[PDB]
Scaffold this active site. Structure first.
Site, PDB file in Angstrom:
ATOM      1  CB  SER B  45      -1.008   0.017   1.158  1.00  7.21           C
ATOM      2  OG  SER B  45      -2.090  -0.867   0.879  1.00  7.21           O
ATOM      3  CE  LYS B  48      -3.596   0.841  -1.558  1.00 13.03           C
ATOM      4  NZ  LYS B  48      -4.345   0.064  -0.531  1.00 13.03           N
ATOM      5  CB  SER B 105      -4.268   0.147   3.589  1.00 14.27           C
ATOM      6  OG  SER B 105      -3.007   0.689   3.939  1.00 14.27           O
ATOM      7  CD  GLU B 141      -4.042  -2.934  -3.441  1.00 10.31           C
ATOM      8  OE1 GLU B 141      -3.893  -4.142  -3.170  1.00 10.31           O
ATOM      9  OE2 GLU B 141      -3.344  -2.034  -2.930  1.00 10.31           O
ATOM     10  CE  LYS B 209      -1.280   3.747   2.368  1.00 11.74           C
ATOM     11  NZ  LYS B 209      -1.259   2.689   3.403  1.00 11.74           N
ATOM     12  CB  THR B 210       1.668   1.041   6.877  1.00  8.84           C
ATOM     13  OG1 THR B 210       0.238   0.984   6.764  1.00  8.84           O
ATOM     14  CG2 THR B 210       2.045   1.918   8.075  1.00  8.84           C
ATOM     15  N   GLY B 211       2.443  -0.522   4.498  1.00  8.67           N
ATOM     16  CA  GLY B 211       2.060  -1.578   3.581  1.00  8.67           C
ATOM     17  C   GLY B 211       2.232  -2.926   4.252  1.00  8.67           C
ATOM     18  CB  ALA B 212       0.581  -5.595   5.453  1.00  8.06           C
TER      19      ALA B 212
END
Lengths: 165, 265
Positions: B45, B48, B105, B141, B209-212
């Site tokens: 994510s 984004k 997200s 996605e 901003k995170t992502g997994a």
């Protein structure tokens, strides 16, 4: 107490008031307004880059409004997932819900969203299922074999799948 | 507390994973600390922020309006879409979609936005346009989170991501208003609690901003600094580890904590 759970999701019912929902879910897990309009959104355990959750929609913004929509992600597991790419290809638009379940496996699915836009009438009811292969479901991470099957008035309107077979 | 690079080596050893990190001066763009900075990592994510940067660029050009309403259908809904699935009947504005994509997200929100900029290929073209010849988006996605080993699809490098973030937020390639808006969405991030925010001292600024992703993929991009002012960009990615989410979050937090502890050392 605890966070939002499948048990709480199941105990919450169409026709309930906002206060009834909050009492079962645990208010500290829940939010309304902002991104969620007049719906109530309740967090469960952390999952992926968000959380497992439930979202409840209501007939209006009034205090006496009733739950007309239930949605959940990763609060419930399929009972006996047997979906395959082959079975998914046997599913066809126009099928009844019963026909679809017979095709993908009777224990392969969980209910993603269910909405009665004419509540208490069932007219126009929309339903989204997720159906999983044997190892497709995950409550904490990412699916590894899932199909999205959506219905109106109990008749399949479309289908999509990821990672099947 | 160990020095940043010491902590990273400890984390790689403990995770059996690969960490990528850049610490960059926001003002000057100088690279202050680096580790596997030229290796590719799945963005998840974190893409984004770039996405909404491209959206804002269109707004600046008068080709888009944040207030424009987008309507969509069941076919558009994918996993991890808590906000967009709620507004299915009513639609969402472009601005609301960016807010959901960045702060929560929201996957379907991101897919709807991706379509406005020409899809993954369009976003990649935007990246090339701003001088990033490395970062690439290939899929939508949810496939972009697959993180297959050695797969170049949907990856960036810590060096490229840091430079691109700096370009988007400070280079005036975006209008001042757009830069403020993109930063604000990052400030309002709701899912980054367990990461750098967990070790951020009182009184510091943070926007992130995170992502997994699958196969252990995890990441964060952030602007942070003391005295409630952004001073540096920090990018931390993890890939190729079977470790639990708890462990992965703890290690990323620990790397952040090391950067903070050794801020002026």
């Amino acid at each position: 107490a605890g966070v939002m759970t499948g048990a709480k999701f199941t105990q919450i019912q169409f026709g309930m008031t906002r206060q009834q929902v909050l009492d079962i879910a645990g208010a500290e897990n829940c939010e309304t307004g902002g991104s969620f309009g007049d719906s109530i959104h309740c967090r469960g355990h952390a999952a992926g880059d968000y959380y497992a959750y439930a979202t409840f929609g209501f007939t209006s913004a009034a205090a006496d409004a009733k739950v007309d929509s239930k949605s959940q992600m990763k609060l419930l597991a399929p009972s006996a997932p047997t979906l395959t790419l082959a079975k998914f290809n046997q599913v066809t638009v126009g099928m009844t819900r019963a026909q679809v379940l017979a095709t993908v496996g009777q224990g392969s699915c969980t209910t993603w969203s269910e909405y009665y836009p004419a509540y208490p009438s069932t007219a126009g009811v929309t339903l989204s299922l997720k159906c999983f292969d044997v190892d497709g479901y995950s409550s904490t991470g990412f699916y590894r074999g899932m199909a999205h099957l959506w219905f109106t008035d109990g008749v399949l309107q479309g289908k999509r799948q990821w990672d099947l077979v | 507390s160990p020095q940043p690079l010491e902590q990273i080596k400890l984390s790689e050893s403990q995770l059996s994973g690969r960490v990528g990190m850049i610490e960059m001066d926001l003002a000057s763009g100088r690279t202050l600390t680096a580790w596997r900075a030229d290796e590719r990592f799945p963005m998840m994510s974190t893409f984004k922020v770039v996405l909404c940067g491209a959206v804002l660029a269109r707004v600046d050009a008068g080709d888009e309006q944040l207030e424009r309403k987008i309507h969509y259908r069941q076919q558009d809904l994918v996993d991890y879409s808590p906000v967009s699935e709620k507004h299915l009947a009513d639609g969402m504005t472009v601005g609301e979609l960016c807010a959901a994509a960045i702060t929560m997200s929201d996957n379907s929100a991101a897919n709807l936005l991706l379509a406005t900029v020409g899809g993954p290929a369009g976003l990649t073209a935007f990246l090339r346009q701003i001088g990033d010849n490395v970062t690439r988006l290939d899929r939508w996605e949810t496939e972009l989170n697959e993180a297959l080993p050695g797969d170049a699809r949907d990856t960036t490098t810590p060096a490229s991501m840091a430079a691109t973030l700096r370009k988007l937020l400070t280079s005036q390639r975006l209008s001042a208003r757009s830069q403020r808006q993109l930063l604000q969405w990052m400030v309002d991030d709701r899912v980054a609690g367990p990461l750098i925010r967990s070790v951020l001292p009182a009184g510091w600024f943070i926007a992130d901003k995170t992502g997994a992703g699958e196969r252990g993929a995890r990441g964060i991009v952030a602007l942070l600094g003391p005295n409630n002012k952004a001073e540096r960009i920090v990018v931390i990615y993890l890939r190729d580890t079977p470790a639990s989410m708890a462990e992965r979050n703890q290690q990323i937090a620990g790397i952040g904590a090391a950067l903070i502890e050794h801020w002026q050392r």
